[PDB]
Design a protein around this motif. Structure first.
Motif, short mmCIF file in Angstrom:
data_model
loop_
_atom_site.label_atom_id
_atom_site.label_comp_id
_atom_site.label_asym_id
_atom_site.label_seq_id
_atom_site.Cartn_x
_atom_site.Cartn_y
_atom_site.Cartn_z
N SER A 32 6.90 -4.34 4.96
CA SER A 32 5.47 -4.60 5.12
C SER A 32 4.79 -3.29 5.51
O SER A 32 5.40 -2.22 5.50
CB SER A 32 5.23 -5.71 6.15
N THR A 33 3.51 -3.39 5.85
CA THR A 33 2.72 -2.25 6.30
C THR A 33 2.30 -2.46 7.75
O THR A 33 1.80 -3.53 8.12
CB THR A 33 1.50 -2.04 5.39
N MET A 51 2.87 4.40 1.47
CA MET A 51 4.02 4.19 2.33
C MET A 51 3.93 5.02 3.61
O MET A 51 2.91 5.62 3.94
CB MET A 51 5.30 4.54 1.58
N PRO A 75 0.80 -1.23 0.00
CA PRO A 75 0.00 0.00 0.00
C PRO A 75 0.83 1.27 0.00
O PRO A 75 2.05 1.23 -0.21
CB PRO A 75 -0.82 -0.13 1.29
N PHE A 134 2.85 1.29 4.46
CA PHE A 134 4.01 0.51 4.04
C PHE A 134 5.31 1.17 4.49
O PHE A 134 5.39 2.39 4.63
CB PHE A 134 4.00 0.34 2.52
#
Lengths: 450, 465
Positions: free
Chosen positions: B389-390, B364, B362, B383
């Motif tokens: 990762s997020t 950031m 997604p 993110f």
DNA sequence: AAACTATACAACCTACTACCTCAT
RNA sequence: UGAGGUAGUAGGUUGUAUAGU
């Protein structure tokens, strides 16, 4: 002269302790060298280990791993290590590291524990200070400790496909601009031509009572079908306010201020959106301060709009994607849209309990992801449009409002490399983290779900 | 076709003058800024809590891994990661039986049993700190589930907060003694399940989060400082203006606005805002009447002068409401001429979800949308390459920043806000969405007003989490 | 002491705000 | 982590029961 330190570990099972010990040793002023720092893909293994043992390695370190004791190359380099121990008579050359507790005294091969083994089975602090004092006992030439070059090494070896990068990337928001506003915001002064018990929301067109006037977009003769006494009202008394003055903010009179005009525009926009999408035969959900809406199951062909999933079946409940919108006139003439999912048992009636709705909302939240949210929102808005570029709002018999179907796409200067789908499973793992972090009075509705 | 601006992640300092961009990783590599001698914790309640804490201590002495090191990193070992003394012995244990608990369980008042058991906990720990020459840094609280279920306010057979942790920490902050509350099911998940069999407290592949959170919380309550900012300008300070609305039923609430002295370190020389009898809970205007306004500002100025030997060159006010002229003038007649004041605010009710067209990751952290010189959008959650990762859920929701009044560049204050987010200390998470002034503002304004028996809060900050 | 048509608030409609909870 | 579900004014709206000249 010999000063190098090598870690013999099973890849990729023991990158953990190898990375930690190598970086701690390189931060302590001792030169370390192993596979996960230097020996990348495409480089031969055993000849480099042979030359570093015969020329460069001062103390050999082998991780007692499950799978790294059975390879041919490690056996070859331990054989040449025994050869170089027979060469210049240094029986303390190798160091056995205990990491895998499953391996006992018998599982390790014939040429390791014949000398003493350093204790590593409880913690690692005493392990590396034991390594340090062994280094000091054998007078290995060392460099004064500095972690600046260790930090630089970590920066350039552990952040390669792993840090941010510079490349263009396109994004999109949930904001939908208004193409055209009403030309005139007209305040209808009906005086006595409004009944006292008149509920304003029942009007077919948006209107707001303001003092004695009526703030509405509709014409003077647009409320004839429900007010038979609006024949007698002449068309000259009602004042007209251009909406361009409201949007530009240059309108300031003693009657209505600019911010009140903007709030009235927003209120009329919300009322118009509610009535216009109620016209489009969309089912309703009772929200506390807004109004949630869902698409009835079977209205859409194949339950796909431009081959995009919009309504589907999971377990026993039917999930219906839906939107809720509130007019926002601050940044630009746009309309923000919220993203919802509404659950039904069969596609006709709603759930009687709200906790079931919330649990279902979360459960379908993890199942799909942001991309599916994007296609669901785009399909919902495009279905909300009749033509190819706008949605056809209704405020009067002769004047309309246009809102673009495509959202306001943005873009950013930098982006990142895109890895595979395993990190989405890690996002499910941090969903489990959120599950196992906090909880509050969950048992009653959880046991009520059966 | 406007663009979004990106801001680089801050580099927080670590041991031996080193800067990294991750608290877990940075603690793993180098260590804390200061090295403590060692700490001697103590348990309260039942012997079951003592033995499960001893088992967890023996387990945490051993290294424990996760499913992968990409998102949640390693735990090398407590002595290997902090250099502090921590063994099975030298832990003080006290016995609490259940006979009085069983007798007072049948009382018709839940609040009475809560008062008596909390008084038992409090006078027991004060007695332990009174007659014993041995010093205990962090007290550890373990509670059973029978009291946790059969003595709830909503369970069926007002100026004090009903939640146990808040009034525990309030009445211990009045006595200036640190403690930390853990439920029994939080760390005993090995044998804690439901009637079906599945562990509700699922911690199988993810023990690293518990390890890092417990270790970092214990080290922060130990008095040691794990990390610090890399680049900071002396003369600036972060006034996180708490405006947690007090909800003590029908008691006069008015305003209990607190503040944080987040000047250069993670500690905050917080001063409790008064009960503030000016107006009522219907004071949604949320400005400051001049008297207490300049009282709080002079308290902050004296705190900065005592903690930094010099007057602050610039003060950043971080609140959650809007500001008007009169409170700014009231702040202005007590700010010196060479100083400047800028009011920043954090809100959630303004929605804007940015979406990703192509890709499987997604929007950031660090991106930002600027509307004008005073109001902008900032993306702190979402993110991040540091964990690949997020951190957020689904599509991250941003924080809407408003410079209410005052002259400040939006980029510099953006960097200030994201570093302040990068200063989360209660758990060893990467960072959080809003600045830790706001999260810890909820904390201090929810524990600070939890009791009416306190007069002056202690200057130290370790008695809050 | 008494004629005009206001007083002089303050109650119920309504967009911007602003609280404990659910289940991951 | 954040998305519901709840009331607080929330700022101008039109009717309660005084005394203004």
């Amino acid at each position: 002269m010999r000063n190098k330190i090598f870690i013999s570990h099973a890849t990729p099972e023991d990158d953990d302790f190898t990375r930690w010990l190598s970086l701690k040793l390189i931060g302590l002023g001792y030169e370390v060298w192993c596979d996960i720092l230097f020996l990348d893909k495409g480089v031969d293994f055993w000849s480099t280990i042979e030359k570093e043992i015969r020329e460069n390695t001062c103390k050999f370190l082998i991780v007692s791993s499950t799978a790294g004791n059975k390879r041919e190359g490690v056996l070859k380099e331990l054989a040449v290590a025994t050869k170089v121990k027979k060469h210049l008579q240094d029986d303390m050359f190798i160091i056995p590291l205990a990491i895998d507790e499953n391996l006992s005294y018998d599982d390790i091969n014939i040429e390791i524990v014949r000398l003493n083994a350093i204790d590593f089975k409880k913690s690692w602090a005493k392990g590396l200070q034991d390594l340090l004092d062994a280094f000091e006992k054998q007078n290995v030439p060392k460099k004064p400790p500095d972690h600046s070059k260790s930090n630089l090494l970590y920066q350039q070896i552990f952040l390669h496909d792993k840090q941010a990068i510079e490349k263009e990337e396109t994004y999109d928001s949930n904001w939908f601009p208004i193409i055209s506003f009403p030309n005139e915001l007209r305040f209808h002064r009906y005086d006595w031509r409004l009944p006292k018990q008149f509920d304003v929301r029942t009007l077919a067109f948006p209107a707001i009572r303001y003092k004695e006037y009526l703030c509405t977009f509709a014409w003077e003769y647009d409320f004839i079908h429900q007010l038979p006494k609006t024949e007698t009202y002449n068309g000259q008394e009602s004042i007209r306010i251009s909406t361009s003055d409201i949007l530009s903010g240059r309108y300031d009179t003693d009657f209505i201020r600019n911010y009140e005009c903007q709030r009235l525009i927003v209120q009329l926009i919300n009322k118009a959106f509610e009535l216009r999408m109620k016209d489009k035969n969309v089912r309703e959900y009772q929200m506390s301060k807004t109004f949630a809406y869902w698409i009835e199951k079977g209205k859409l062909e194949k339950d796909k709009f431009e081959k995009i999933k919009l309504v589907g079946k999971q377990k026993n409940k039917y999930w219906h994607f839906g939107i809720s919108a509130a007019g926002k006139l601050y940044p630009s003439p746009v309309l923000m849209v919220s993203s919802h999912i509404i659950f039904t048992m069969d596609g006709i009636n709603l759930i009687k309990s709200k906790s079931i709705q919330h649990s279902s909302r979360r459960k379908q939240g993890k199942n799909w992801w942001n991309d599916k949210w994007r296609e669901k929102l785009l399909a919902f808005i495009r279905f909300l449009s009749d033509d190819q570029n706008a949605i056809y709002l209704n405020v009067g018999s002769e004047e309309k409002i246009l809102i673009s179907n495509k959202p306001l796409k943005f873009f950013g200067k930098m982006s990142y490399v895109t890895p595979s789908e395993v990190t989405l499973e890690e996002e499910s793992v941090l969903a489990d983290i959120n599950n196992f972090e906090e909880d509050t009075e969950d048992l009653d509705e959880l046991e009520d779900i059966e | 076709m406007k663009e979004l601006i990106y801001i680089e992640e801050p580099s927080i300092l670590f041991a031996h003058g080193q800067k990294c961009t991750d608290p877990r990783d940075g603690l793993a590599l180098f260590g804390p800024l200061n090295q403590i001698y060692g700490i001697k914790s103590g348990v309260v309640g039942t012997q079951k809590g003592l033995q499960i804490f001893k088992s967890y201590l023996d387990k945490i002495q051993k290294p424990i891994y996760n499913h992968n090191n990409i998102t949640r990193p390693m735990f090398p070992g407590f002595e290997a990661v902090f250099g502090c003394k921590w063994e099975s012995q030298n832990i003080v244990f006290k016995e609490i039986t259940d006979e009085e608990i069983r007798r007072y369980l049948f009382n018709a008042s839940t609040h009475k049993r809560t008062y008596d058991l909390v008084t038992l906990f409090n006078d027991k720990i004060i007695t332990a700190n009174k007659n014993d020459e041995e010093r205990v840094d962090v007290w550890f609280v373990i509670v059973p589930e029978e009291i946790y279920k059969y003595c709830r306010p909503n369970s069926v057979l007002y100026n004090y907060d009903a939640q146990f942790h808040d009034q525990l920490k309030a009445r211990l902050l009045e006595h200036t003694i640190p403690t930390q509350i853990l439920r029994e099911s939080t760390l005993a998940w090995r044998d804690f399940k439901n009637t079906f069999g599945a562990p509700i407290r699922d911690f199988s592949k993810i023990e690293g989060h518990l390890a890092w959170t417990i270790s970092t919380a214990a080290y922060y309550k130990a008095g040691g400082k794990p990390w610090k900012l890399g680049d900071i300008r002396p003369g600036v300070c972060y006034l996180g203006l708490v405006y947690k609305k007090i909800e003590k039923s029908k008691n006069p609430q008015n305003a209990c606005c607190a503040a944080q002295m987040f000047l250069d370190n993670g500690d905050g020389t917080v001063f409790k805002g008064e009960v503030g009898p000016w107006y009522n809970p219907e004071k949604g205007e949320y400005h400051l009447k001049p008297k207490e306004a300049k009282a709080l500002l002079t308290q902050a100025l004296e705190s900065y002068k005592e903690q930094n030997k010099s007057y602050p060159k610039e003060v950043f006010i971080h609140a959650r409401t809007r500001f008007n002229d009169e409170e700014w003038n009231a702040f202005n007649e007590v700010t010196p001429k060479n100083t400047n004041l800028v009011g920043v605010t954090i809100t959630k009710s303004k929605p804007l979800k940015l979406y990703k067209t192509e890709g499987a990751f997604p929007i950031m952290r660090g991106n930002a949308y600027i509307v004008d010189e005073k109001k902008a959008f900032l993306w702190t959650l979402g993110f991040v390459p540091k964990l690949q990762s997020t951190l957020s859920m689904e599509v991250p929701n941003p924080i809407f920043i408003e410079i209410n009044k005052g002259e400040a560049e939006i980029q510099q204050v953006l960097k200030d806000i994201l570093a302040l987010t990068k200063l989360n200390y209660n758990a060893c998470i990467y960072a959080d969405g809003e600045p830790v002034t706001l999260r810890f503002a909820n904390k201090i304004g929810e524990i600070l007003t939890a009791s009416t028996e306190i007069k002056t809060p202690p200057l130290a900050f370790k008695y809050y989490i």
